[PDB]
Ligand binder design. Structure first.
Ligand SMILES: *[C@](O)(C(N)=O)[C@H](C[C@@H]1CCNC1=O)NC(=O)[C@@H]1[C@@H]2[C@H](CN1C(=O)OCc1ccccc1)C2(C)C
Ligand SMILES: *[C@](O)(C(N)=O)[C@H](C[C@@H]1CCNC1=O)NC(=O)[C@@H]1[C@@H]2[C@H](CN1C(=O)OCc1ccccc1)C2(C)C
Lengths: 301, 301
């Protein structure tokens, strides 16, 4: 038993991390087959980053301006192109540690593991959720750019995130591995605002199921509700509307506990209206929304 | 910026995980050089586990009774001995992925990463603190026994924990890699109680420094205190006494923020006496005690 925020084992991704230096800017790249992927701002000086023209900077770079290191081995760059906000560096050696992989674009509310890296070296691993406002609540210092986010399906690494920047509020913003940002952000050092964030309702229900499985059942009431009645209450608390798709996705947890989703919704409606009255749920005084239904099924069976 | 519970990258430990089967009991082992380490209760039937005689069970086992698998490769066991609550299985092949490693016994209050594994296969990675009462708050299902806890010092894996059991309260208990339990526990399925737990004061101060670094500074007051006055207040709230050793260990964080440790102690004394008055610290409505000073320096510089 027990419930913890857990990352995927990072080994298959550790074998893909390299250091990329262009001039005096160093950050991390992801080496898959004979390609290194990194944020395109590796080509900027500190001055450029205030308002960069990436096409103009990349023109004046050669293959030779890119120093790519995997441990004490230099990889020769034999080609380079920009895809949206990501540089692709063709290199002379395919990575023999390349795992089975895919590039995916995740949806808001979904989680992934972040492998935080510095100078091509893995430092730590933790779980993030893609917020409704397309930011993530991470831990990134200078040198972490190019660190990636991923899920594992048995032996297959789904890469979904590459780290680019910190917004003025201290939340984090990045691209998919095609270099398209999540959210309405650009890779320029100028002030950018995220949308108001919202609470991921389906994940709060998942976490309430985890609490029940772990014996925290004080919030369970004898009531049911309708999806419609639930959403009319929850919208006042800035909860995302719960769809039938979400209800369907919670099916496995409803089956594991014998508690109907709309029964749980009635418990959550009461928690939102009445507060936690000085009680905790899985040790927490706040409702947690960064655990998906999958995160809960995976870990709790 | 930002602060998250972060595990060490698990790659160097993933390469050491194997499946160990004896009869119809399967669990995980740790393959280092030509030795596989696993919990000794791998030799028990469900009946035996209620009150086992491990020496009597191991006598009647041969090398051949132990099925050790690393992927689709069987490892032949060519010898076996018991060290306290751990089986050592000599095998015919040294593990070529053996990292630089040490066996350490951690102290209460210290953290480690747990690589949760099932059938020799890594599933997830998360941080735990060794509680003052020698339990850990983990996430372990059936099949997780033999999963290990570790710290990494650059390229060196310090193994400090192997998972054996769940106490009736749902906290977790295990041994060092010499098979000595943390705490007054035995590997038998009979009801066992941990001591009353206590709050790791030095870690709460570390986390308050992290909150300051991340701009959460509302709890900072103009006061100082003495170690003695602090400990007389904190003992009523079931906080461990703060020693000069702890004060010394917080030195780097005091230096990073320009806030004296005894200044922070005065802020914590007020939080303990007055509560959080409906405010949060790093998003949390409770004080966090499972981040060490090292966890905070590492991540926050
Ligand atoms: C990244 O380049 C790197 N080398 O690690 C860096 C990661 C930041 C640094 C602190 N936390 C992070 O997430 N990204 C940037 O510096 C990007 C880059 C300019 C500006 N910027 C950014 O994050 O702006 C805010 C900032 C905060 C702290 C330090 C530096 C900048 C662009 C957007 C191209
Ligand atoms: C371990 O053997 C395994 N095969 O994973 C198992 C891990 C438990 C199972 C659920 N969470 C865990 O931490 N350990 C045990 O089953 C040990 C073993 C007997 C009894 N016991 C144990 O944890 O007792 C409580 C229990 C809870 C759930 C399921 C089974 C038992 C000893 C102590 C030798």
């Amino acid at each position: 038993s027990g419930f913890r925020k857990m990352a995927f084992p990072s080994g298959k991704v550790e074998g893909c991390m390299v250091q990329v230096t262009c001039g005096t800017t160093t950050l991390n790249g992801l080496w898959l087959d004979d390609v290194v992927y990194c944020p395109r701002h590796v080509i900027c000086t500190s001055e450029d980053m205030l308002n960069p023209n990436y096409e103009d900077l990349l023109i004046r770079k050669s293959n030779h301006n890119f120093l790519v290191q995997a441990g004490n081995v230099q990889l020769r760059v034999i080609g380079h192109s920009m895809q949206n906000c990501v540089l692709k560096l063709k290199v002379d050696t395919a990575n023999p540690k390349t795992p089975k992989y895919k590039f995916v674009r995740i949806q808001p509310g979904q989680t992934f593991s972040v492998l935080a890296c510095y100078n091509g070296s893995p430092s730590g691993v933790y779980q993030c959720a893609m917020r409704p406002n397309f930011t993530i609540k991470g831990s990134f210092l200078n040198g972490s750019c190019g660190s990636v986010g991923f899920n594992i399906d048995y032996d297959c690494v789904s890469f979904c995130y590459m780290h680019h920047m910190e917004l003025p509020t201290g939340v984090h913003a990045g691209t998919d591995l095609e270099g398209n940002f999540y959210g309405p952000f650009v890779d320029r050092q100028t002030a950018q605002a995220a949308g108001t964030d919202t609470t991921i309702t389906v994940n709060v229900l998942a976490w309430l199921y985890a609490a029940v499985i772990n014996g925290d059942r004080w919030f369970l009431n004898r009531f049911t509700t309708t999806l419609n009645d639930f959403n009319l209450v929850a919208m006042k608390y800035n909860y995302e509307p719960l769809t039938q798709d979400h209800v369907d996705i919670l099916g496995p947890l409803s089956a594991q506990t014998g508690i109907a989703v709309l029964d749980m919704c009635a418990s959550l409606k009461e928690l939102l209206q009445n507060g936690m009255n000085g009680r905790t749920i899985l040790g927490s005084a706040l409702l947690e929304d960064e655990f998906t239904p999958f995160d809960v099924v995976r870990q709790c069976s």
